[PDB]
Structures are given as structure tokens and as C-alpha cells.
Amino acid sequence: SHPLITLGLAASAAGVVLLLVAGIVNALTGENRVHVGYAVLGGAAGFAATALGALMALGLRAISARTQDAMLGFCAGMMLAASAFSLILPGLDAAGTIVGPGPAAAAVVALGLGLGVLLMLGLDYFTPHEHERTGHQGPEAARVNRVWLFVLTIILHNLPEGMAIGVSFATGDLRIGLPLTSAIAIQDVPEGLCVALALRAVGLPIGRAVLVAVASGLMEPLGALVGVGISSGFALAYPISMGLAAGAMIFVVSHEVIPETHRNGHETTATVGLMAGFALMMFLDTALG
Numbered sequence: 264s265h266p267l268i269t270l271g272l273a274a275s276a277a278g279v280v281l282l283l284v285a286g287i288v289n290a291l292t293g294e295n296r297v298h299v300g301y302a303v304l305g306g307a308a309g310f311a312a313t314a315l316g317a318l319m320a321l322g323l324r325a326i327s328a329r330t331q332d333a334m335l336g337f338c339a340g341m342m343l344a345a346s347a348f349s350l351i352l353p354g355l356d357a358a359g360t361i362v363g364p365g366p367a368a369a370a371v372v373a374l375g376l377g378l379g380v381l382l383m384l385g386l387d388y389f390t391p392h393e394h395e396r397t398g399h400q401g402p403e404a405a406r407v408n409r410v411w412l413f414v415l416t417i418i419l420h421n422l423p424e425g426m427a428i429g430v431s432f433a434t435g436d437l438r439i440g441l442p443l444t445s446a447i448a449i450q451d452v453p454e455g456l457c458v459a460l461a462l463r464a465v466g467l468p469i470g471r472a473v474l475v476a477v478a479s480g481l482m483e484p485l486g487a488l489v490g491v492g493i494s495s496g497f498a499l500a501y502p503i504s505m506g507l508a509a510g511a512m513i514f515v516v517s518h519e520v521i522p523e524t525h526r527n528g529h530e531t532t533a534t535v536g537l538m539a540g541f542a543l544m545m546f547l548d549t550a551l552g
């Protein structure tokens with residue numbers, strides 16, 4: 264039944280297109296106007312922090328692969344900690360006030376986690392892009408400009424970070440939105456440096472690589488629109504979407520980032536980066552309040 268694979272392909276494609284487009288459409292309804300406001304501003308702060316990091320690449324231009332793998336692990340560790348403490352744990356509390364505490368509330372967040380993996384896995388199959396380890400991925404990718412493939416890798420990476428900012432603001436609760444957005448925005452400064460350096464390395468002169476890195480940061484306000492929309496349809500959509508954004512980010516770290524550091528032989532340097540970034544975000548979870 265190749266009809267069945269065509270049916271699943273149609274449902275898969277429409278399901279990811281629908282999530283993104285219906286998220287934006289739902290975000291733009293009148294009931295969400297205040298929440299979208301906070302979420303896009305949070306996203307625009309991440310764009311600004313990305314821009315700042317990218318500007319710092321004009322000085323460095325290129326770095327040892329060992330240093331690059333450390334910095335990628337560092338940003339990755341910050342995002343694992345942001346997923347755990349700024350999305351999963353508040354999602355648990357939010358779920359508990361809707362369905363009751365205990366494992367039933369964890370089931371809300373856990374199902375969202377799985378939905379986030381499925382969304383990113385589907386985008387990973389349908390979006391042509393390229394990694395320096397496994398080469399080009401996605402439909403028709405072998406005959407796509409290689410710089411553009413790497414740009415799309417960066418776009419896929421930052422979609423969940425934008426979505427997380429949107430989800431965290433979906434109820435107007437700055438107690439949730441500010442810690443999450445602070446974590447992503449601080450992480451975006453080293454990340455903008457890594458992105459500009461990686462774009463330079465795939466063939467752009469440093470000045471154009473910096474400008475493309477700055478433009479890539481616009482995925483965070485855009486993804487924040489998606490996050491607002493998917494998290495606001497009904498009361499449970501909010502803790503489910505917390506888990507969804509967390510699972511999408513965890514996929515980016517474990518599927519997109521950490522594998523790039525392992526096959527170069529710098530598993531050990533990436534690991535010290537992961538530990539430091541995770542520890543740092545824990546600290547900032549309590550120092551920033």
C-alpha cells in the first residue's frame with residue numbers, strides 16, 4: 264500500500280505546515296494582542312543579542328575546530344538548562360493547576376515533549392540543509408547552493424528558540440516569559456558569534472557572514488509568533504506547548520548540534536562546554552531570580 268505512504272506523507276507535510284501557519288494565524292487574533300506584543304519583543308531582544316555576538320566575529324574571523332566545538336557545547340548546555348528549568352519545570356506547575364499535580368501533570372509535559380521532537384524531525388526531513396559531518400540533508404539537497412543549505416541549518420536551529428519565547432509569554436505571565444527569554448537572549452550572544460564564524464567557514468567573506476548571522480536572528484521574533492499561537496487555543500495548550508518547545512530544543516541540541524562536535528574528535532571539549540553552559544544557566548536561574 265504505497266497509497267498508505269502517500270497518505271502519511273500528505274498528513275506529515277500538512278501537519279507541519281498547519282502547525283506553523285495556524286500558529287501564526289491564531290497568534291494574530293484579537294484576544295492575543297497583548298501576549299503577542301510581549302512575545303515578539305522578547306524575540307526581538309534575542310535578535311539584538313544575536314546581532315551583538317555576530318559583530319564580535321569581525322575581530323576573530325576564524326577559530327580552531329577545538330574552540331568552535333567548545334563554544335557550540337556551551338550554547339547547547341545553556342539551552343538544555345533553559346529547557347529543563349525555564350520550560351519543563353514551569354510547564355509541570357502549570358499543568359498541575361489545570362489537571363492536578365502528580366504524574367498526570369508530567370504526562371501533559373511529556374506528551375508535549377514528544378510532539379516537539381516530531382515537529383523538528385519532520386522539519387528536518389522536509390527542509391534541505393547541511394551539516395559539516397553528515398553532509399546535505401532533505402529534498403533535492405545535492406543540487407542546492409551549499410551556503411544556503413547551511414543558512415537553513417541555522418534557521419531550523421532558531422525556530423524552537425523563538426517558539427519557546429512565544430510559548431513562555433502565552434499567558435501574559437512575565438514570571439515565566441522573562442526567565443526563559445533572558446536565558447535565550449544571553450545564550451544568543453555567543454551563538455551569534457558561532458553562527459557568523461560557521462557561515463564564514465562555509466564560504467562567505469566575514470562581512471557578509473556577519474550580516475547573514477544578524478538576519479538569521481529574525482527567526483526568533485518570527486518563531487515567537489508560532490509559539491504564541493499554538494499555546495493559546497485552550498488552557499492545556501500552554502503546558503503542552505511548554506513541553507513542545509522544550510522537546511524541539513532538546514532535539515536541536517542532541518540531533519543537530521552535539522553530533523557535529525563528536526566526529527571531529529572533540530567529544531571531550533564539547534562536553535566541558537555542555538557542562539559549563541548548563542551550570543551557568545542554573546546559576547542565572549537563581550541569580551537573575
Ligand SMILES: CCCCCCCC/C=C\CCCCCCCCOC(=O)[C@H](O)CO
Pocket residue numbers: 283284287288289291292293294
Ligand atoms: C518559516 C515559517 C514562515 C511562515 C510564513 C508566515 C505564513 C503566514 C502568512 C500570513 C499570515 C497572516 C495572518 C493574519 C491573521 C489574521 C487573524 C486576524 O484576527 C482575527 O481574525 C480576529 O481578531 C479574531 O479575534
Ligand SMILES: CCCCCCCC/C=C\CCCCCCCCOC(=O)[C@H](O)CO
Pocket residue numbers: 272274275276278279282378381382384385386388389402
Ligand atoms: C502537533 C505536532 C505536529 C507534528 C507533526 C508530526 C508529523 C510529521 C512528523 C515527521 C514527518 C517525517 C516524515 C519523513 C518524510 C520522509 C521523506 C520526505 O521528504 C520528501 O521527499 C517529500 O516528498 C518532500 O516534500
Ligand SMILES: CCCCCCCC/C=C\CCCCCCCCOC(=O)[C@H](O)CO
Pocket residue numbers: 408410466467471474475477478
Ligand atoms: C537586519 C538584517 C540585515 C541583513 C540583511 C541580509 C544581508 C545579506 C548579506 C549578504 C548575502 C550575499 C551573499 C553573497 C553571495 C554568496 C555566494 C556564496 O556561494 C558561493 O560561494 C558561489 O557563489 C557559488 O555559487
Ligand SMILES: CCCCCCCC/C=C\CCCCCCCCOC(=O)[C@H](O)CO
Pocket residue numbers: 408410411414418475478479481482485
Ligand atoms: C525569518 C528569518 C529570515 C532569515 C533570512 C536570512 C537571509 C540571508 C540572506 C542571504 C543568504 C546568502 C547565502 C545565499 C547564497 C547564494 C548567493 C547568490 O549567489 C549569486 O551570486 C547569484 O546567483 C548571482 O549574483
Ligand SMILES: CCCCCCCC/C=C\CCCCCCCCOC(=O)[C@H](O)CO
Pocket residue numbers: 376513517525
Ligand atoms: C524528563 C524529560 C525527559 C527528556 C528526555 C531528553 C533527554 C535525552 C536527550 C538526549 C539523549 C542523548 C543523545 C545522544 C545519544 C547518545 C548515544 C548515541 O550513540 C550514537 O549512536 C553515536 O555514535 C554517539 O553519540
Ligand SMILES: [Cl-]
Pocket residue numbers: 338339340342516520
Ligand atoms: Cl543551542
Ligand SMILES: [Cl-]
Pocket residue numbers: 324463467468469470
Ligand atoms: Cl574573510
Ligand SMILES: [Hg+2]
Pocket residue numbers: 334335337338453454455457
Ligand atoms: Hg555558541
